[PDB]
Ligand binder design. Sequence first.
Ligand SMILES: Cc1ccc(C(=O)N(CCCN)[C@@H](c2oc3cc(Cl)ccc3c(=O)c2Cc2ccccc2)C(C)C)cc1
Ligand SMILES: Nc1ncnc2c1ncn2[C@@H]1O[C@H](COP(=O)(O)OP(=O)(O)O)[C@@H](O)[C@H]1O
Ligand SMILES: [Cl-]
Ligand SMILES: [Cl-]
Ligand SMILES: [Cl-]
Ligand SMILES: [Cl-]
Ligand SMILES: [Co+2]
Length: 349
Amino acid sequence: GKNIQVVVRCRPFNLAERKASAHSIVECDPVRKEVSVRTGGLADKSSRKTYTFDMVFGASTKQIDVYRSVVCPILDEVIMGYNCTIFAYGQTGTGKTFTMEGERSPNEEYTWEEDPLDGIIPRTLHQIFEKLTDNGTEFSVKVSLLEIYNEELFDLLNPSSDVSERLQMFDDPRNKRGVIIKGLEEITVHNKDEVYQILEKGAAKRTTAATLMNAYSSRSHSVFSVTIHMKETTIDGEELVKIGKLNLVDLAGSENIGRSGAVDKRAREAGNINQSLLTLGRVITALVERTPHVPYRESKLTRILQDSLGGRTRTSIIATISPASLNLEETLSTLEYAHRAKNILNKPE
Ligand SMILES: Cc1ccc(C(=O)N(CCCN)[C@@H](c2oc3cc(Cl)ccc3c(=O)c2Cc2ccccc2)C(C)C)cc1
Ligand SMILES: Nc1ncnc2c1ncn2[C@@H]1O[C@H](COP(=O)(O)OP(=O)(O)O)[C@@H](O)[C@H]1O
Ligand SMILES: [Cl-]
Ligand SMILES: [Cl-]
Ligand SMILES: [Cl-]
Ligand SMILES: [Cl-]
Ligand SMILES: [Co+2]
């Protein structure tokens, strides 16, 4: 089913990897939607595995390419009144956060909205304001940013929370698929430029969080949500009301998720964070295969996203990998995970 998409983004070789003279073991064919990884020893050319996805982005792919292929078709649905999710999944250091958030280009050269290094979040907020303005619709934008760490929920947008008070999740009595997270702060964004300070405060609150908690931000899931209340009036009479929602999910690093058949796999995958990643896999698979049992309850992440994941929706996963020999096992495990989420057969060579 086309409503759930799985894509892979390979990042360029970094400086660490080039100074270790790491080998480049990954090949991405965009046209064939294939990613092939040399799986064997230093000299073994013959030995390679191939996987097929909805899309594949090689190392020269820029932020804009990712946004237009993956994001923009989804944003169209959100603005049409739906509730949609995009995940970034992958080993620590592979670009989950670069993809979701992005970076500032050097010197002064860009307004934040025009910076080509922008990731999904800034691009999305920019487009919501620009597009709804051009359409003449009346709208408002609200945002919240929830972090998940050791099963505890944290609001990163609460200035006065300060800091590490945990929120409380309840089933929503008025929504069978919904939860209410008690005291989660949804900030209203009156003017597009305000997101910058809101999120800059979020980052400082996030930096603080790292100073007390163990391996924070590699082990945490971050859920950014934008809700848009929109009102249009048609040519003849009608006032029209729609609520769209977009979840942008930067997942805990996948480094301890094993490939199948791995020696120590159970031991490595122990702990709440690793199991939440696996639970998510199960939910996605069950949604793709359309099996009746989809286990949303077995993690906090999937309880929070159930409402989005289970409706008339678009859901994409961006699986980020390193090109390097330093990363081989983690890259293969990421591809296996992505492949298990949505099973796409290799086309004939
Ligand atoms: C053009 C640009 C791109 C990235 C940044 C940046 O480095 N940020 C900090 C986080 C980098 N991983 C931005 C940023 O911070 C976030 C903090 C949290 Cl807690 C969650 C998401 C973001 C995020 O998406 C961004 C990127 C951004 C968002 C809105 C406007 C401009 C940039 C600024 C708002 C400081 C600043 C400017
Ligand atoms: N597509 C990319 N192009 C260039 N640099 C990238 C890319 N993806 C990640 N990086 C860089 O690699 C480092 C780690 O990326 P990050 O997004 O923090 O990974 P993760 O969030 O998956 O741990 C950062 O310095 C980031 O700037
Ligand atoms: Cl090697
Ligand atoms: Cl469009
Ligand atoms: Cl199960
Ligand atoms: Cl189970
Ligand atoms: Co490539």
